[PDB]
Write an enzyme that holds these catalytic residues in place. Structure first.
Site, short mmCIF file in Angstrom:
data_model
loop_
_atom_site.label_atom_id
_atom_site.label_comp_id
_atom_site.label_asym_id
_atom_site.label_seq_id
_atom_site.Cartn_x
_atom_site.Cartn_y
_atom_site.Cartn_z
N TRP A 276 2.07 -6.50 -6.43
CA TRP A 276 3.24 -5.87 -7.02
C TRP A 276 4.50 -6.03 -6.18
O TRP A 276 5.55 -5.52 -6.57
CB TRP A 276 2.98 -4.38 -7.27
N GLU B 203 2.99 1.94 -8.87
CA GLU B 203 3.19 3.22 -8.20
C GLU B 203 2.41 4.34 -8.87
O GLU B 203 2.05 5.32 -8.21
CB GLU B 203 4.69 3.55 -8.17
N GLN C 207 -2.67 8.88 -5.23
CA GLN C 207 -3.98 9.34 -4.78
C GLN C 207 -5.03 8.23 -4.86
O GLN C 207 -6.20 8.49 -5.08
CB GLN C 207 -4.43 10.56 -5.59
N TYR D 156 8.03 11.47 -6.04
CA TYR D 156 7.70 10.23 -5.35
C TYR D 156 8.00 9.01 -6.22
O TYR D 156 8.67 8.07 -5.78
CB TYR D 156 6.24 10.21 -4.92
N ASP E 161 5.50 10.17 0.14
CA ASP E 161 4.09 10.26 -0.17
C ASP E 161 3.35 10.86 1.03
O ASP E 161 3.97 11.34 1.99
CB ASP E 161 3.53 8.88 -0.53
#
Ligand code: SF4
Ligand SMILES: [Ca+2]
Ligand SMILES: [Ca+2]
Length: 349
Positions: free
Chosen positions: A24, A37, A42, A120, A138
């Site tokens: 990415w 993203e 997590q 975020y 983050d």
DNA sequence: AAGACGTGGAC
DNA sequence: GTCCAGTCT
């Protein structure tokens, strides 16, 4: 009080020198950055890499993702976890099309209004894909910033996140924020790691107050995890004489929303088989073959598999669906019931 | 506020 | 075993 300019040079240098060549980061395209993203929330980078390439191969553009049906997008997400992320992204994207005609907003407030986009993601997408100097805090950033500035507040609090977000404003490189933000995230990922950070290798070891005091391994401060609840679950694997199997689509609210599963019911304790029998009759079982545990973040599933045979005395009504064995692969099951199936298949051998 | 919300690596 | 890689309600 803090020499930001120097900090920003030794960080961006190390970044350009050590950055990972991830899928990415091939381009600065809002859409692909956005997908990456959301997947990364997590979820470790190494886990996301395969999903990102299957997903973008199947949904190259924002409109392709919008035009797809729930089952296809959700199948693409099978095994990743926190499946509301993809329901919110699917909707957030359908919005940019029906409302914005396909272009991703560059206005922070306009971008945050979309589902799944928290503080975020706003910082990650906008600062990378458009240059907007919004912070992308983050777990990596919070760990770095807490060590650098010796912030001793519980990161779990949202207020502490908002403090970090103001620190970022103060030491940012407003010239090239996207590069600055990714460098902080990458720094926390590669150097300033949760355990035994490589402070000597670190490029900004001279600025880190924790290193100066020798307490880097004591940060960040985060409270201990709440103990999760145990939940016995009874599962039925029912196949007719034509080999077809019965499955049902979970409701769109709550745990494992809109995912397919084998009929099951929470059993407070005794009578797992009885409860399964009665529940299926309303809307012929045999002894269980295996029992195992499957963990969530907030509870544990203690499963028990019951093979069974079904005879058609009526139509298969919603949410149920009669699927041949060869067509199960087209449905998106959670990892728990993917194993249920594997256990049933190896038992029948 | 803090519980809900998946799953897998690294200690 | 523990810690950890975000958002919604
Ligand atoms: S000097 Fe050590 S503690 Fe500070 S940021 Fe670098 S790795 Fe983290
Ligand atoms: Ca938001
Ligand atoms: Ca529900």
């Amino acid at each position: 009080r803090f020499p930001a300019r120097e900090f920003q040079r030794d960080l961006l240098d190390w970044f350009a020198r050590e950055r990972r060549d991830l899928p990415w980061r091939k381009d600065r395209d809002p859409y692909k950055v956005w997908v990456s993203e959301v997947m990364l929330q997590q979820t470790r980078v190494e886990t996301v890499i395969p999903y990102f390439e299957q997903f973008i191969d199947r949904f190259p553009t924002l409109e392709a993702l919008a035009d797809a049906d729930e089952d296809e997008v959700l199948k693409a997400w099978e095994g990743l976890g926190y499946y509301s992320r993809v329901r919110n992204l699917h909707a957030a994207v359908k919005e940019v099309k029906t409302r914005y005609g396909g272009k991703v907003p560059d206005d922070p407030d306009e971008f945050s209004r979309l589902k799944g986009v928290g503080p975020y993601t706003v910082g990650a997408v906008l600062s990378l894909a458009y240059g907007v100097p919004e912070p992308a805090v983050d777990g990596n950033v919070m760990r770095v910033l807490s060590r650098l500035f010796l912030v001793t507040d519980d990161i779990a609090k949202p207020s502490t996140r908002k403090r970090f977000e103001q620190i970022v404003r103060e030491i940012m490189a407003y010239e090239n924020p996207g590069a600055f933000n990714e460098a902080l995230i990458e720094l926390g990922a590669l150097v300033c790691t949760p355990r035994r950070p490589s402070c000597l290798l670190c490029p900004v070891q001279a600025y880190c107050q924790a290193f100066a005091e020798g307490v880097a391994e004591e940060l960040p401060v985060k409270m201990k995890k709440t103990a999760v609840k145990q939940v016995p679950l009874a599962v039925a694997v029912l196949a007719d004489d034509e080999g077809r199997v019965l499955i049902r689509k979970r409701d769109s609210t709550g745990l494992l929303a809109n995912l397919w599963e084998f009929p099951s019911c929470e059993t407070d304790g005794a009578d797992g088989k009885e409860k399964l029998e009665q529940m299926v009759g309303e809307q012929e079982l045999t002894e269980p073959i295996v029992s195992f545990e499957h963990a969530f973040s907030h509870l544990v599933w203690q499963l028990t598999v019951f093979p069974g045979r079904l005879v058609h005395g009526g139509p298969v009504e919603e949410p149920y669906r009669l699927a041949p064995e060869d067509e199960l692969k087209a449905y998106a099951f959670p990892v728990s019931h993917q194993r249920v199936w594997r256990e049933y298949k190896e038992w029948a051998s």
